[PDB]
C-alpha cells in the first residue's frame, strides 16, 4: 500500500550493484508498488525489481537499453495522480519552472522525475514534486558529491508521507516530508 520510488541505477554503466545496505533494507512482499524513473539499463535490474514487488512501473531513460519502456507514464493509487518521467526531456534538466510547466501539461497531483541524481521533494503552486535521486549513488557530470538515495511513500488517504532514505558515509539517514491534497 506504500510505493517505492527509485531510479538511476546505471548498472553496469556506472555501478556494479546496489549498495549492500540498500540490498538489505529492500525486502520483498512489504512493498506492492514500484515506480522507476531512471535508466536501470540492463534487464537484470528489472528482474530484481520484479522480486521486490508485483506492480513495477518504469519510464524510458536516456541510457536504457530498453525494449519499449514508455517515455512517460501516469498512474493512480486510489487518491493522487502521479506522473513518471525520467527528466532528461525537461529542459533545463533540473529547473523546477520547467517541471511545473510539465505538471500543468500532465495535470497530476505528484510529479516524479529523475536524471538529476539529486534528491528533491517540495511543494510548488499547491502541487508536489519528488525526485528520488540515484539509488546507487551513480556518477553524474554535474555533481561530484552524490548521495545514494531512494524514496518510499505510503498513501493512507488524501495524505501522503514521503520517507527519503539516504546513505551518508556508512549510516542510513532518513528525512520525512508530508503532503496534504489541497
Amino acid at each position: 500500500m506504500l510505493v517505492l520510488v527509485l531510479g538511476d541505477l546505471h548498472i553496469p554503466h556506472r555501478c556494479n550493484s546496489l549498495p549492500a545496505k540498500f540490498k538489505k533494507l529492500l525486502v520483498p512482499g512489504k512493498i506492492q508498488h514500484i515506480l522507476c524513473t531512471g535508466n536501470l539499463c540492463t534487464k537484470e535490474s528489472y528482474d530484481y525489481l520484479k522480486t521486490l514487488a508485483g506492480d513495477v512501473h518504469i519510464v524510458r531513460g536516456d541510457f536504457d537499453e530498453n525494449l519499449n519502456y514508455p517515455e512517460q507514464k501516469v498512474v493512480t493509487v486510489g487518491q493522487f495522480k502521479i506522473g513518471l518521467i525520467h527528466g532528461h526531456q525537461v529542459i533545463p534538466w533540473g529547473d523546477m519552472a520547467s517541471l511545473a510547466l510539465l505538471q500543468r501539461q500532465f495535470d497530476v497531483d505528484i510529479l516524479i522525475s529523475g536524471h538529476t541524481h539529486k534528491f528533491e521533494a517540495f511543494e510548488h503552486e499547491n502541487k508536489f514534486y519528488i525526485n528520488p535521486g540515484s539509488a546507487t549513488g551513480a556518477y553524474n557530470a554535474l555533481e561530484t558529491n552524490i548521495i545514494p538515495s531512494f524514496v518510499l511513500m505510503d498513501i493512507q488517504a488524501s495524505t501522503v508521507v514521503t520517507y527519503v532514505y539516504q546513505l551518508i558515509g556508512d549510516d542510513v539517514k532518513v528525512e520525512r516530508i508530508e503532503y496534504k491534497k489541497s
Binding site: P12, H13, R14, N16, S17, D62, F63, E65, H88, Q89, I91, P92, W93, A97, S98, A100, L101, R104, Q105, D107, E125, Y139, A141, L142, T144
Partner: protein, 296 residues
Amino acid sequence: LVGRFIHLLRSDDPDQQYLILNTARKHFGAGGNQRIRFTLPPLVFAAYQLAFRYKENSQMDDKWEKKCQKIFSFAHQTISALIKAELAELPLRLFLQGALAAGEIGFENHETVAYEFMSQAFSLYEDEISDSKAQLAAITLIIGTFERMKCFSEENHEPLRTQCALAASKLLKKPDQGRAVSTCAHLFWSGRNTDKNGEELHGGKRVMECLKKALKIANQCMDPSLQVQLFIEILNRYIYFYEKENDAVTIQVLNQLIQKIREDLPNLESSEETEQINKHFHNTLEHLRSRRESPE
C-alpha cells in the same frame, strides 16, 4: 558469463586506476564487436570518473591536466571502437556525456575537447539516425546537454546554437519540429558563455525569434487536435520566459496567442483526448490567475 566482474571499483591513487583501465580495454578488445557492445561503455564512464578524481587532487599532482587530456583521448578511442561496432544511439550519448564532463572539469585545452565531443555526437546524429522518433530523442538530448555547458566562448557557442536550431527545424514530422524549436529557445536564453563573465546570455530578442517560428509550424499542422496541443505548449513556454523577467515577452503577444487558442478551441469532437487537452488549457489559465501582476 559475467566477465563483467570488474567490480574491482575499490582502488586508490589515480595512476593505478588509469593503468587498470587500459588493461581492461585491452582484455575486452579481443572479445569482438559482440562483447564490446556492453563491456566498453562502463570503461568510458570509468574514464570520466577518473578524470574527476584527477581534478580533486589538483595540488598533489602537477601533471593532472595532461592526465585529463590523455584520459579523454582514451575515452574518445573507446567510443570510436563502439562506433566501429556499428552502434549509433549509444556512442552519441557517450559523446554527450564526455562533453559534459570535459566542460565541468576545466583542464587546459578542455574547451577544444568538449567541442570535439559535441561535434562527434552531431556527426552521428546527421548520418546514422534515420528513424523519426530516434532523431527526436537524439536531438532533444543534444539540446538539453548543450544547455548546461558554460565552458564555451562565443566563438564555439554560436555554431552549436545555430546548428541546434537548424537541426531541430528539419525534423520529419511538423509537430515534432515545433516542439524541438520550442525546446531550442532555451539555448538563446539560459545559455552561458565565457565572455559574459559567468552571466547568462539573456538574448530576449533571440528567444522570441525561436518562439515565432514555433507558431508558424503549428498552423501548418492541418490537424485540429494536435494543432491545438502545440498552442497550449508554446503559450506555456512563453509563460516560462515571461516569468523569468525577460522584457522581450509582451502582454500583447500573450493576449493574441491566448485569444487564438480560445477562438478555435471548442471546435473539436468530445473525447478523452480533447478532455485532457481542455484541462491542460484550464490549468494554464488557473496558474495565470495566481497573483496577477500582468494585465490581460
